[PDB]
Amino acid sequence: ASCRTPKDCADPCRKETGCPYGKCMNRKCKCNRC
What we know:
voltage-gated potassium channel impairing toxin, ion channel impairing toxin, calcium-activated potassium channel impairing toxin, monomer, 1 helix, alpha+beta, Defensin A-like, two-stranded antiparallel sheet
């Protein structure tokens, strides 16, 4: 998972949790796994 923007992890997060949420760190990717 590599993002460019916060909502860019929405694609991986949609794989991770299934929800198109999340945030992108300076050079990291985060999802809102809830």
